[PDB]
Design a protein around this ligand. Structure first.
Ligand SMILES: CCCCCCCCCCCCCCCCCC(=O)OC[C@H](COP(=O)(O)OCCN)OC(=O)CCCCCCCCCCCCCCCCC
Ligand SMILES: CCCCCCCCCCCCCCCCCC(=O)OC[C@H](COP(=O)(O)OCCN)OC(=O)CCCCCCCCCCCCCCCCC
Ligand SMILES: CCCCCCCCCCCCO[C@@H]1O[C@H](CO)[C@@H](O[C@H]2O[C@H](CO)[C@@H](O)[C@H](O)[C@H]2O)[C@H](O)[C@H]1O
Ligand SMILES: CCCCCCCCCCCCO[C@@H]1O[C@H](CO)[C@@H](O[C@H]2O[C@H](CO)[C@@H](O)[C@H](O)[C@H]2O)[C@H](O)[C@H]1O
Ligand SMILES: CCCCCCCCCCCCO[C@@H]1O[C@H](CO)[C@@H](O[C@H]2O[C@H](CO)[C@@H](O)[C@H](O)[C@H]2O)[C@H](O)[C@H]1O
Ligand SMILES: CCCCCCCCCCCCO[C@@H]1O[C@H](CO)[C@@H](O[C@H]2O[C@H](CO)[C@@H](O)[C@H](O)[C@H]2O)[C@H](O)[C@H]1O
Ligand SMILES: CCCCCCCCCCCCO[C@@H]1O[C@H](CO)[C@@H](O[C@H]2O[C@H](CO)[C@@H](O)[C@H](O)[C@H]2O)[C@H](O)[C@H]1O
Ligand SMILES: *C(=O)CCCCCCCCCCCCC
Lengths: 126, 104, 84, 79, 155, 67, 171, 220, 459, 170, 120
């Protein structure tokens, strides 16, 4: 029985077919990945260990993330079929759904009260 | 798999410093420099009962007797159960006994 | 409340109860491969025995480098803030 | 500071570790960590009660006090 | 932080892709932006959709609680993938099989509760009998009216 | 401390803990035995359960088939 | 990034821990720990790497099928019941600089010794940076490894936050 | 339930403290004589929980089972309740067997010690309660219902019978773990171990869907 | 009201004629004295409101809003004086003058008898507020925040001016006491539909109603701390106060015109509560939390029941103290790390123990722990909306779950976990900051002992 | 202290102690200790306080409101008359709220006092509560937050119109 | 259980319906059937404040037990004899309900057996 990965249960590394096909090209790629991490680690450490530094080591990666999650969204938005349907279905759809649920419920309740068939015997707080 | 000679040396140097640092966390004899039988077990329990039971129950009883129970329906008790053959203190009434049972 | 000598005593105690090690040729500086003739599977078992002895885990990245008893003592003393 | 008991005293003979060494001997294998487990089968750890013995802890004295307690009850109801 | 070091629009040309990768501290071979629909991702990298729980806990992370290193590109949904929220870790049982057994167990139990409701257990007795016309007054019945008598006989 | 740790050996015990443990284990068994001597009905059954199939048709008011 | 040997040894350790979780009893675990070591030993000298990788590949699939769904975890290991338990008591050393003078006055000797450690850190920083500059290739560091002190009287570069880090049981 | 359940946690705290924050029963064992007082409290609490006659748990659990047996009720719910009563004896045996009996499975530096008077006295008071509290409470509270005391023998003794069988079945399962045979996990074993997968699925799917909507749709 | 208007005006010469180094001491001391005298407005009668003159009146609705307004000025001064330390003297006095002028406009707004007088002061508040945001905010985005704030308000407010002038022509008066007696029912016609919208939309934008709320997260993220406090605490409540008064003359048309806005609010509160779970900016999270809380107030005002009007009043007062406290808490972190990113500084309970306690108490009031007046207000709205329609309990109950999750997510993220290693400038909490937090939470919790004073006229 | 007619209480019937045990009653001794240790000192402090109050006797009064013409007698738009009628209606509304509160308090006191027999023994109180809630609902329910005498009168006239219509056709 | 198999698996037309019994007249096959006697008056159970479910044909024993309990305080081990009397009265009450079930069961069986006569 083979592992079936899902969105919320990743494929274990030990069962990854590609984790064993480590060619000279892949080993080269891994070395380059470690080179970037080491370069960033050194830049951070030279500030982190600096005895005369008091404050916050600003992280451009964190700044880019919070900026991407807000300021950069509208400039890269295009009204097309996809964004219009999601906009209409998710923004307008729930408002119409709830309007009919409440309008229908209230129309029924009003009709019962107007006929004396809704029991409000002790109802004097509203 | 084993430490390289350069890794061995760095770990050795850091190890010396770390142990000196931990030794420096020990407090000296004068630190901190602070600015300027059965019967004694009855006392603490006696004073504790006085300040945590007697005084609070004096306050509550005064509060309940002279403020809460002077207002309608603030303390409402379920009326006492009355069984056959009982005597009422208020009136002196005597509740009759139940009928004679069949034998069982 | 561990001490440097207490750690060494117990690390050597465990190794003296391992059948693949001559308890007389065992010193704190013996290299599990060059001096005692063990292999890398034996090394894994020795590390696992140390984790059971002291009740904590040594990650594989660190574990694979401990090749003599003294390095095990140094590793354990470091993680447990033992300075005497 | 701490005196470790002498290591030579830890032997697998007389313990279920000896049984395992015999099962592995049949196949040609050996258990090299056996002596490192011996302490768990020796000394004050050698004999432990069974599950029924655990439930029956204190039954001997509870039963003794029961007989005296009911023996006294019969004596009183006799008078 | 200068504007050249901030997220930009979707990269159209290979030079832009190489420039975007540099800004995000990635290999140009590892850099892949989100699909250029009108959703507003721009050139922000699309990283693996993995929880931070999946990262190596023995590595000396700059941020150990997050398991993040300083300067590495953060996942778009990092705040959803912190160790307090969504875990994507591999599971000993396949996700699809896990859903079948949980749903199947629940469905079976619900069915059997309907069955046990349609065929209740009970004892072989008649109804409990109460005096005074089934306690008509005690149960609050109107004193001024009269219940039809409820009579109980001996047996 | 008053109880020193041991290496690979059974722990040091005090008399107080052994005696107190035994006394309360014995109290549990005395109590069960004493309670079961007086209140076995609470375990075995307070009242007899009748056999309905052995009640006569007279006492149940069952008329004969020709009535 | 892990070699073949590293992968095989990590699988052996992981499989023994899950095996011990299944067995529980020490005598039973010893029996099956030896049987498991025999299986790894049966192919120890395999030379055709293609064959060995297939053996490792299959062994990982066998491990996944037979793993304990709730293996034993050392209490302080990641995922253990005491993991990160004492982090709320770990306070960084720089917090002491903000103590009120009357708080420092309670530990005159501790704070005199602390002042010497800060002097050592200050006097050593520029040499630490210089050593890293002249030992790092032009492109930059390619690994995270750091060097030792070379000259006598020097300290290993970037030592402060390793040496002065909080104790594992800080209270 | 408040008496013996509180005692059970304190007994487990006593063991956990003695084994340096170890909480896995697979790393316990051999504590029956090393921790005699915690052992005694753990046995009394386990018996009270499973409804041993005349301990504190017997004065509620056995009436509840008798009332359920003779009530006009869902038949499936009644069976589930009775089976869970048998399981109560199984998991109670699981704690006693793996924690107290057999040979020690904990680390070599022995620091077992339960001689602090605060530990002993606090457990002692709850032990006395776990023996007598139920009897004392049942004999003082006024009656508010009509208890159902007439029933067939097999409805009267059902609680004791299924509990005993649970103990017998549990012992066989536990002693089988000592055989030199290596078993592979069934689906039932994994379902029980992983809590029916309810946390695994719900605690991943529901947060994911809700948190994805929060950013993708509502916010963006 | 002259006993409050005139001393408020005198704060301006006081600030300008003070010694250079005593502007904060003097303005803070005397604004606290003015706040003390505001308690004299509690002389309320069961039947009649307190009608001072032809211009000004105070009833049980405007009284708690006045006392909150006069309480906030000293708190704002304390909150502002640290980030303004390097500002030159004349520009400090100008900043304080804008705060005083805002208080002057606000107390006159909440007590104006005539709706057109209310409109003018209602609109005058834009000027000092806009100036405070765009002149003393820190970031480039403050200029855009000022514009969004300005034109969202005027887009709805200018139609309100036309409607009010039309009403005075038709009825003959905009005096609120007169309107209580001369009010006539509103009949169904397209003319009255747009009269209804012109009368309500200006207030909906200020609440803000869901869909017209985009200006608010901009304005907070850019405003200085004092701007955020008065914006959250008082200026939002201009809209709620506006509807509570103007709905008198819109019946029975509100029976059906409310439906689109109840739907936007009922759904909006869930949408904006969910949004809080994924916010990365701490100030933006608190801003979105206000939108969700004010959605209840809009629903309460629109369904027009005695219980909903009492809940709306208590909610407006309670949210004023809670939300302003949360901005002050977030600002205190900002003064150390100079960033609003929530995930930047973590585990702060380890470093600032007492401040973490203020964080806990502000969170518990935000999620409406009983018996805080936050819970009292929300519960009264829940009770009244259930009578409006039973199904609303599903939406109201779900929003309670989400509110707890984001209230405690904010607490857990910033206070708990491990501290950030490289942030080494977290200096101990100043006495000023601790006093600022206590002057929010202590009156908030003390009101639980006597809730009637913040329940409004329907009590 | 309070009017017993407004807040009625049935006569109290306490049974006399009728022990059938030889053991002492722990409550009786505790009762005696409470009266000695708690009741007597508390009573002395109160008696001293009552002495000081007796020296400084002064009075307050229950405000009396003369009746004024109600909304039905007010000409349309005559604010001067509508204002006094409206203020009177608002005062009466507050009073009627408290009348309902008194009846509910009677009902709740009866339920607790009568114990397990409350269902049969509180019929009179439940009836009075039912009738007063009906009258209060007729007057004041559904008026809305912006209620007034004018709206209350409109509600009544609608009810009178319906009752006339039903009566006529019947 | 036994009766449940007969109704749910066997013939349900000759088993009592627990929710509709009795279905035959109380005097059917029972000439001159006496009435159940009630020893406790309505007013006595009202003052004893018995729970309504406890106001049955055994209430006089419950009242006697309740009085003893109050009068024997603090001796909570007294009134065992009174408790047994109430328990026993309840047992007979239950047996009477068991006879009602069996009477109905035999009448239903007789009816079917008779309705075979009228078509055989
Ligand atoms: C009703 C909305 C209609 C939705 C159906 C889809 C409409 C549509 O298809 O629009 C497509 C159009 C461009 O289409 P496309 O061909 O893809 O352009 C790229 C081609 N190279 O796209 C356009 O340019 C037209 C723009 C459509 C505007 C959509 C307006 C509705 C969007 C939702 C508003 C949300 C309201 C929220 C309510 C308040 C509460 C949040
Ligand atoms: C009525 C209306 C219902 C409204 C429900 C609102 C549901 C909100 C959904 C959660 C939104 C996400 C908030 C963030 C919380 C979060 O992400 O935490 C994740 C947490 C992880 O938990 P854990 O598995 O223990 O992992 C720890 C080990 N690392 O996992 C969690 O703690 C979250 C788990 C909760 C998931 C929701 C479960 C809902 C169950 C409903 C079905 C039952 C119906 C009611 C019961 C039947 C009635 C008889
Ligand atoms: C006292 C307890 C009372 C309640 C007991 C409830 C038990 C009810 C269990 C219902 C769940 C059964 O769920 C069922 O499990 C089996 C076992 O894998 C699955 O079986 C399937 O999956 C497995 C594994 O992938 C494959 O062999 C194959 O595809 C197929 O057999 C079914 O797809 C699933 O529907
Ligand atoms: C109304 C009465 C209420 C109940 C009263 C019950 C009183 C019972 C008092 C029991 C006191 C027993 O005291 C204890 O008994 C056990 C019996 O195993 C002894 O234990 C003895 O056997 C065990 C092994 O079986 C070992 O510890 C050892 O061999 C020996 O000590 C203890 O050394 C003794 O200290
Ligand atoms: C016929 C109609 C004319 C109406 C004129 C009424 C006001 C006349 C005021 C005359 C006095 C003005 O006073 C002049 O200005 C200010 C305010 O006092 C003083 O200097 C000021 O310094 C600082 C503020 O900068 C403050 O401490 C304080 O306001 C004051 O000391 C000058 O030293 C003084 O020369
Ligand atoms: C919450 C605390 C607020 C603190 C406010 C601080 C400012 C206090 C302002 C005090 C104003 C007092 O104002 C003045 O008081 C005196 C009492 O001596 C009143 O004196 C009058 O009161 C009433 C009036 O009906 C009558 O008894 C009588 O005519 C006279 O005693 C005056 O009518 C009033 O003009
Ligand atoms: C967020 C957006 C909110 C949008 C809210 C939209 C609300 C819509 C309200 C619809 C009701 C408008 O008011 C309604 O208009 C119609 C005309 O069409 C009027 O109709 C009037 O003229 C027509 C002639 O065609 C006559 O037949 C009718 O007798 C007369 O009433 C009604 O008098 C009135 O009931
Ligand atoms: C006889 O006296 C009745 C006792 C009740 C026995 C319970 C039988 C449980 C059977 C399982 C239920 C399955 C759903 C139809």
């Amino acid at each position: 029985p083979k592992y079936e990965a899902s969105r919320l249960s990743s494929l274990p590394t030990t069962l990854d077919p590609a984790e064993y096909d480590i060619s000279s090209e892949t080993r080269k790629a891994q070395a380059e990945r470690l080179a970037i991490r080491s370069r960033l680690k050194r830049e951070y450490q030279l500030q982190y260990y600096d005895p005369s530094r008091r404050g916050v080591i600003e992280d451009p990666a964190l700044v880019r993330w919070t900026y991407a999650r807000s300021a950069n969204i509208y400039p890269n938005f295009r009204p097309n079929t996809k964004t219009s349907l999601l906009g209409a279905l998710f923004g307008i759809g729930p408002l119409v759904f709830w309007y009919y649920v409440f309008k229908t419920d209230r129309d029924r309740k009003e009709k019962l009260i107007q006929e004396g068939k809704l029991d409000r015997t002790f109802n004097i707080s509203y | 798999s084993g430490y390289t000679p350069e890794e061995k040396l760095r770990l050795q140097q850091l190890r010396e410093l770390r142990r000196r640092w931990l030794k420096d966390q020990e407090l000296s004899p004068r630190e901190p420099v602070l600015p300027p039988n059965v019967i004694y077990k009855t006392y603490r329990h006696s004073i504790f009962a006085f300040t945590h039971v007697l005084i609070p129950v004096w306050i509550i009883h005064y509060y309940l007797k002279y403020h809460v129970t002077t207002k309608p329906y603030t303390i409402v008790e379920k009326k006492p159960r009355i069984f056959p053959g009982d005597t009422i203190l208020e009136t002196g009434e005597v509740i009759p006994p139940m009928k004679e049972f069949p034998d069982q | 409340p561990l001490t440097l000598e207490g750690i060494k005593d117990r690390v050597l105690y465990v190794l003296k109860l391992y059948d693949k090690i001559d308890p007389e040729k065992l010193s704190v500086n013996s290299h599990f491969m060059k001096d005692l003739g063990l292999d890398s599977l034996d090394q894994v078992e020795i590390i696992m025995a140390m984790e059971d002895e002291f009740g904590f885990e040594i990650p594989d990245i660190d574990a694979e480098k401990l090749m003599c008893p003294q390095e095990i003592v140094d590793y354990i003393a470091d993680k447990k803030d033992v300075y005497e | 500071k701490m005196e470790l008991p002498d290591y030579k005293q830890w032997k697998i003979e007389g313990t279920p570790l000896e049984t395992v060494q015999e099962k592995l001997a049949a196949r040609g294998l050996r258990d090299p960590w056996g002596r490192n487990e011996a302490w768990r089968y020796m000394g004050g750890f050698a004999n432990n009660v069974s599950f029924v013995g655990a439930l029956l802890k204190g039954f001997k004295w509870g039963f003794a006090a029961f007989v005296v307690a009911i023996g006294a009850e019969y004596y009183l109801e006799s008078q | 932080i200068t504007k050249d070091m901030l997220p930009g629009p979707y990269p159209k040309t290979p030079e832009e892709r190489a420039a975007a990768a540099k800004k995000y501290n990635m290999r140009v071979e590892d850099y892949e932006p989100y699909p250029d629909d009108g959703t507003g991702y721009g050139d922000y990298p699309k990283l693996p959709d993995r929880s931070q729980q999946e990262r190596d806990p023995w590595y000396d992370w700059d941020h150990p609680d997050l398991r993040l290193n300083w300067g590495e590109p953060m996942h778009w949904d990092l705040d959803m993938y912190i160790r307090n929220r969504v875990d994507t870790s591999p599971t000993p049982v396949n996700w699809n099989l896990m859903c079948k057994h949980l749903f199947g167990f629940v469905a079976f139990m619900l069915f059997m509760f309907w069955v046990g409701e349609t065929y209740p257990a009970y004892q072989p007795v008649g109804p409990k009998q109460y005096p005074y016309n089934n306690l008509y007054l005690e149960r609050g019945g109107d004193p001024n009216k009269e219940p039809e008598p409820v009579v109980h006989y001996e047996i | 401390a008053h109880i020193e740790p041991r290496y690979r050996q059974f722990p040091q015990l005090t008399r107080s803990q052994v005696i107190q443990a035994e006394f309360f284990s014995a109290t549990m068994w005395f109590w069960i035995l004493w309670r079961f001597w007086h209140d076995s009905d609470a375990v075995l059954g307070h009242f007899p359960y009748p056999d309905p199939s052995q009640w006569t048709d007279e006492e149940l008011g069952i008329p004969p088939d020709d009535e | 990034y892990l070699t073949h040997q590293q992968k095989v040894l990590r699988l052996y350790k992981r499989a023994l821990r899950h095996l011990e979780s299944w067995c529980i009893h020490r005598d039973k675990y010893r029996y099956f720990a030896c049987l498991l070591r025999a299986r790894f030993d049966e192919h120890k000298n395999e030379k055709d790497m293609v064959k060995a990788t297939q053996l490792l590949r299959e062994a990982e699939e066998e491990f996944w099928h037979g793993q304990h769904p709730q293996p034993y975890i050392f209490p302080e290991s990641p995922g253990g019941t005491s993991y990160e338990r004492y982090e709320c008591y770990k306070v960084p050393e720089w917090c002491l600089d903000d103590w009120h003078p009357s708080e420092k006055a309670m530990y005159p000797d501790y704070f005199a010794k602390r002042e010497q450690w800060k002097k050592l850190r200050r006097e050593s920083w520029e040499r630490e940076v210089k050593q890293l500059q002249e030992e790092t290739p032009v492109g930059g560091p390619r690994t995270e490894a750091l060097p030792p002190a070379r000259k006598q009287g020097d300290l290993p570069p970037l030592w402060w936050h390793i040496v002065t880090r909080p104790r594992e049981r800080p209270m | 339930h408040a008496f013996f359940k509180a005692m059970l946690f304190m007994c487990s705290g006593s063991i956990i403290h003695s084994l340096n924050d170890e909480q896995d029963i697979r790393k316990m064992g051999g504590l029956f004589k090393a921790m005699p007082f915690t052992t005694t409290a753990l046995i009394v609490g386990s018996l009270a929980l499973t409804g041993m006659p005349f301990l504190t748990g017997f004065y509620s659990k056995d009436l509840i089972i008798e009332a359920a047996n003779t009530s006009y009720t869902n038949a499936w719910a009644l069976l589930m309740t009775l089976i869970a009563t048998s399981f109560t004896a199984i998991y109670s045996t699981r704690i006693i067997f793996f924690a107290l009996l057999g040979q020690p499975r904990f680390p070599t530096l022995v620091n077992i010690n339960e001689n602090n008077p605060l530990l002993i006295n606090s457990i002692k008071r709850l032990l006395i309660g776990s023996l007598f509290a139920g009897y004392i409470i049942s004999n003082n509270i006024p009656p508010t219902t009509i208890p159902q005391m007439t029933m067939p023998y097999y409805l009267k003794t059902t609680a004791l019978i299924v509990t005993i069988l649970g103990f017998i079945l549990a012992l066989e399962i536990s002693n089988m773990t000592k055989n030199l045979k290596y078993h592979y996990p069934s689906n039932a074993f994994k379902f029980s171990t992983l809590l029916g997968y309810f946390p695994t699925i719900m605690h991943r799917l529901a947060p994911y869907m809700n948190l994805s909507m929060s950013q993708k749709s509502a916010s963006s | 009201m002259l006993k409050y208007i005139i001393p408020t005006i005198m704060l301006m010469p006081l600030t300008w004629l003070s010694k250079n180094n005593m502007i904060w001491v003097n303005s803070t001391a005397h604004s606290l004295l003015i706040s003390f005298t505001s308690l004299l407005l509690m002389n309320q009668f069961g039947d009649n409101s307190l009608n001072f003159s032809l211009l000004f009146f105070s009833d049980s609705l405007s009284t708690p809003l006045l006392i909150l307004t006069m309480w906030l000025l000293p708190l704002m001064l304390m909150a502002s004086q640290h980030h303004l330390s390097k500002e030159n003297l004349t520009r400090k006095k100008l900043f304080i003058t804008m705060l005083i002028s805002l208080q002057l406009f606000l107390i006159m707004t909440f007590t104006a008898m005539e709706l057109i007088l209310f409109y003018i002061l209602f609109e005058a508040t834009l000027v000092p507020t806009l100036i405070i945001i765009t002149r003393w905010g820190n970031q480039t985005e403050r200029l855009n925040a000022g514009l969004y704030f300005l034109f969202y308000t005027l887009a709805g407010s200018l139609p309100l001016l036309v409607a009010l002038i039309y009403i005075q022509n038709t009825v003959g008066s905009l005096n609120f006491l007169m309107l209580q007696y001369w009010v006539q029912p509103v009949h169904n016609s397209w003319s009255n539909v747009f009269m209804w919208l012109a009368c309500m939309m200006a207030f909906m934008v200020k609440m803000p109603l869901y869909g017209l709320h985009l200006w608010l997260p901009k304005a907070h993220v850019e405003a200085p701390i004092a701007g955020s406090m008065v914006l959250a605490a008082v200026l939002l409540k201009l809209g709620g106060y506006g509807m509570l008064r103007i709905t008198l003359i819109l019946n029975p048309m509100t029976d059906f015109m409310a439906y689109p806005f109840i739907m936007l609010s009922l759904w909006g509160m869930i949408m904006t509560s969910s949004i809080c779970l994924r916010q990365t900016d701490l100030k933006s999270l608190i801003a979105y939390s206000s939108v969700s809380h004010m959605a209840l107030v809009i629903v309460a005002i629109l369904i027009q029941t005695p219980w909903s009007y009492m809940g709306a009043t208590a909610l407006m007062i309670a949210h004023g103290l809670t939300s302003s406290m949360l901005f002050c808490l977030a600002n205190s972190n900002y003064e150390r790390i100079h960033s609003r990113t929530m995930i930047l500084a973590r585990g702060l309970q380890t470093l600032l123990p007492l401040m973490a306690t203020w964080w806990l108490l502000a969170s518990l009031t935000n999620l409406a722990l009983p018996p805080t007046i936050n819970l009292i207000g929300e519960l009264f709205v829940v009770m009244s909306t259930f009578s409006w329609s039973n199904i609303t309990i599903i939406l109201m109950g779900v929003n309670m779950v989400i509110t707890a999750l984001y209230s405690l997510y904010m607490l857990i993220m910033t206070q708990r976990g491990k501290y950030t290693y490289h942030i080494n400038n977290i200096s101990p909490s100043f006495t000023r900051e601790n006093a600022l937090m206590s002057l929010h939470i202590l009156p908030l919790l003390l009101l639980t002992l006597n809730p009637k004073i913040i329940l409004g006229p329907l009590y | 202290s309070w009017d017993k007619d407004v807040y009625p209480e049935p006569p109290r019937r306490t049974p006399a102690p009728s022990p059938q045990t030889s053991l002492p009653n722990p409550i009786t001794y505790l009762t005696k200790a409470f009266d000695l240790l708690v009741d007597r000192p508390v009573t002395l402090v109160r008696e001293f306080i009552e002495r000081q109050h007796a020296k400084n006797k002064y009075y307050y009064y229950h405000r009396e409101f003369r009746r004024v013409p109600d909304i039905t007698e007010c000409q349309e738009k005559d604010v001067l008359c509508m204002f006094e009628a409206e203020m009177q209606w608002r005062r009466d509304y507050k009073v009627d709220q408290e009348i309902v509160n008194i009846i509910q308090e009677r009902l709740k006191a009866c339920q607790q006092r009568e114990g397990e027999s409350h269902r049969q023994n509180c019929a009179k109180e439940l009836e009075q509560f039912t009738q007063v809630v009906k009258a209060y609902q007729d007057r004041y329910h559904d008026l809305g937050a912006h209620y007034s005498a004018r709206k209350c009168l409109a509600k009544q006239k609608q009810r009178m119109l319906a009752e006339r219509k039903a009566a006529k056709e019947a | 259980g036994a009766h449940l198999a007969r109704r749910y698996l066997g013939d349900a037309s000759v088993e009592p319906d627990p929710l509709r019994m009795p279905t035959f007249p109380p005097d059917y096959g029972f000439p001159e059937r006496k009435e159940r006697e009630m020893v406790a008056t309505q007013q006595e159970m009202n003052d004893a404040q018995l729970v309504l479910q406890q106001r049955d044909y055994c209430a006089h024993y419950l009242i006697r037990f309740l009085k003893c309990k109050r009068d024997s305080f603090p001796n909570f081990l007294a009134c065992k004899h009174e408790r047994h009397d109430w328990d026993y009265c309840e047992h007979l009450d239950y047996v009477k309900r068991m006879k009602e079930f069996e009477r109905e069961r035999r009448l239903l069986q007789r009816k079917k057996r008779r309705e075979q006569r009228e078509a055989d």
